[PDB]
């Protein structure tokens, strides 16, 4: 808890630090047994009212809950794991150089058109589930069974309806297009995201193992892991793949996380 | 290893300089630096790219002055200078090209680029990821084996060492972020079929290879591993067929002697 607790001194000693390392795989819609990492073909509704996208066409937020070494044995004068640093990168960036498989020729006898278009790259590290706010491009969209979407949507949901509050608490369920991190909450999470729109924009993906992000806030306090659990969330929609017919599919990639944590004492 | 203090003295530092040439596919004796023309499969299942169409990672293993005769000393890589060699060759818009329009100049090299380099005390550790798990990769490449649909996102079975030239296709393999403790790697993918190469050169820029704790790559067996990919884009000939074009990469690494246990 960043606010419901008194945040005291950091513990030192050999056993006072730990490390989490993992991959979050993308959830682009996975329309059949061969298309992990891709969405279904994008289909365009004839009016706002008749928008009824298939579940397999909607990328979702990825989330992992990582159990940490058990501390204490409750509440009160207690120790919590605090996330201090993050290393992260997209995994498989060179796979986008496959311009020879099932593609559309750029011109006669040319190479295939590569993955391009709208991208969303997003990652978060928190001591509890990412807190979400719903915002709809079109409030009359019918979101499909099996997704968790903003309910009782009104025309105000197209700009800001404070009723649409949720926790990123399930995989393959929260569509990227209906939810964003809630800037009024998330005191115990650090989140970072970039949306690059446009149907021709090229992916620009950097990799290195030399870059670290510090997760401490203004007061030197990182995310504090309630119940000894670390929450990682990601979206890496790289753009769209185009088949020869012109049908287009979202293509996503996995994200790596390495988080360093230390023990910190808190009260209440 | 317990990593102890840096050895000082005039004999305690050394320098490695070299060029790594690109491995773009080299379809014949005239086309060093180029791939074969790119062919597009009709389905994911039938994707069977020719070896000469697949750029691969370049790697050089550089022996260093032998330490310890037969606690020991290790060479520590501290700084890197690097750049792409021959960036101005891309201004040749008059050789065998496709006119941008009637009576115009040739279309320059452009499109998807991957610029990558690593310095390590051992072979670069690789993780396999496939665009399409059903691709048939050709004889003479080293590619992710027993691929499944999970290979399209993350299959932890695909682990390799970049331990051979002209072998590891760029499109199949990335640096494994779960390893490479003893390597520093840097890469950038720029996608899109009309993206222009943007290449900087200077002899005034140094990259420091030390980590948080002030430790650079430590060269096991007195060997420095350099790896590189410099796919600059595609060349378009008049018929419209396109070929990857790559360039060499210069490395200068400064090393110092460090005691370890």
């Amino acid at each position, epitope marked *: 808890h960043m606010g419901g607790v008194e945040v005291l001194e950091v513990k030192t000693g050999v056993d006072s630090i730990t490390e989490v390392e993992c991959f979050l795989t993308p959830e682009m819609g996975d329309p059949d047994e061969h298309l992990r990492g891709f969405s279904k073909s994008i289909s365009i509704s004839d009016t706002f009212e008749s928008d009824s996208p298939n579940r397999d066409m909607l990328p979702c937020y990825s989330v992992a809950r990582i159990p940490l070494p058990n501390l204490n044995e409750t509440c009160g004068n207690i120790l919590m794991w605090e996330a201090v640093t993050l290393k992260t990168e997209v995994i498989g960036v060179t796979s986008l150089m496959n311009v020879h498989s099932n593609g559309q*020729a750029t011109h*006669d*006898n*040319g*190479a295939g058109k590569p993955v391009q278009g709208t991208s969303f790259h997003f990652f978060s590290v928190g001591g509890e589930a990412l807190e979400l706010q719903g915002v709809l491009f079109n409030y009359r969209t019918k979101y499909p069974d099996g997704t968790i979407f903003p309910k009782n949507a009104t025309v105000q949901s197209q700009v800001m309806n404070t009723e649409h509050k949720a926790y990123l608490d399930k995989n393959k369920a929260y569509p990227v297009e209906c939810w964003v991190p809630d800037p009024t909450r998330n005191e115990n999470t650090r989140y970072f995201g970039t949306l690059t729109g446009g149907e021709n924009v090229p992916p620009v993906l950097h990799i290195t193992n030399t870059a670290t992000t510090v997760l401490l806030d203004e007061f030197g306090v990182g995310p504090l892991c309630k119940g000894d659990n670390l929450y990682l969330s990601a979206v890496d929609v790289c753009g769209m793949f185009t088949n*020869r017919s012109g049908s287009q599919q979202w293509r996503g990639l996995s994200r790596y996380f390495k988080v360093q944590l230390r023990k910190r004492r808190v009260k209440n | 290893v317990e990593v102890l203090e840096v050895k000082t003295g005039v004999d305690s530092i050394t320098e490695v300089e070299c060029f790594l040439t690109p491995e773009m596919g080299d*379809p014949d004796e005239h086309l060093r630096g180029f791939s*074969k*023309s*790119i*062919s*597009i*499969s*009709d*389905t994911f*299942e*039938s994707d*069977s790219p*020719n070896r000469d169409m697949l750029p691969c990672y370049s790697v050089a293993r550089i022996p260093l002055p032998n330490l310890n005769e037969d606690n020991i000393l290790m060479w520590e890589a501290v700084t890197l200078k690097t750049e792409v060699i021959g960036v101005t060759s891309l201004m040749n818009v008059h050789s065998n090209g496709q006119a941008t329009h009637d009576n115009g100049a040739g279309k320059p090299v452009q499109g998807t680029s991957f610029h990558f380099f690593s310095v390590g005390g051992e072979a670069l550790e690789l993780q396999g990821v496939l665009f399409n798990y*059903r691709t*048939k990769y050709p004889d003479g490449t080293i590619f992710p084996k027993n691929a499944t649909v999970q290979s399209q996102v993350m299959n932890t079975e695909h682990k390799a060492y970049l331990d051979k030239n002209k072998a590891y296709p760029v499109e199949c393999w990335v640096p494994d972020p779960t390893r490479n403790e003893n390597t520093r790697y840097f890469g950038t993918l720029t996608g899109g079929e009309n993206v222009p190469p943007v290449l900087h050169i200077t002899n005034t820029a140094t990259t420091v290879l030390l980590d948080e704790f002030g430790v650079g790559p430590l060269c096991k067996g007195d060997n420095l591993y350099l790896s590189a990919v410099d796919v600059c884009g595609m060349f378009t000939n008049r*018929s*419209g*067929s*396109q070929q990857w074009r790559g360039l060499s990469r210069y490395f200068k690494v400064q090393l110092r002697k460090r005691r370890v246990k």
Partner: single-chain antibody
Amino acid sequence: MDIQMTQSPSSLSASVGDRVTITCRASQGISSYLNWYQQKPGKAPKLLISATSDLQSGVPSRFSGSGSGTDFTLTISSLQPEDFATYYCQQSYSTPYTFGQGTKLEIKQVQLQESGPGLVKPSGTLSLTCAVSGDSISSSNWWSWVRQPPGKGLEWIGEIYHSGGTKYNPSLKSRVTISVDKSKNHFSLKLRSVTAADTAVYYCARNRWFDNNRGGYYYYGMDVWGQGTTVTVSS
């Protein structure tokens, strides 16, 4: 894409030593994706030219092809007795692969074998098998079915890859199945709800692509054919 191929003339007689040219037109542009086939009476078609102008090994150098986009020409330099045959163009640009109607010219290794019942009752299921010898099913090519009704003219039914993916002619997709069995090194055809229009010679073929360095979409041609088997619909 729906691409109709029109061939001209529909028939021609000539004398040994003559120069003959056969023309074909495509209903839309197909760039250089055009094959030519020679079919001698009662035999399977034989691939002569792939990708507008590339001669198959064994095809005598008097055969030549040219053209682009919509219009193509097959030329024989000096007619010879062995050349009496029906000649077919085929666009390889887009599935369903389509053949021209054929030009009948009158003059004055891998092995495939089709098998199955010669007779099928009306509205029954036609079933055939193609045994592949001297080559693995697991090769990097498609395994195709093509039929020729009594009035001649070739129709591509569909094809299968060793890993199980299929491509079917949209005219037959509701009633066709193609299967493959790597353990028996064969592939099969099932055609449901047959009618008299299904009476034909059925061919299995290898549809492979050609490493011709042109770039772009793979260039496919049917370079190995079975001998053909007749299936007759009768009550």
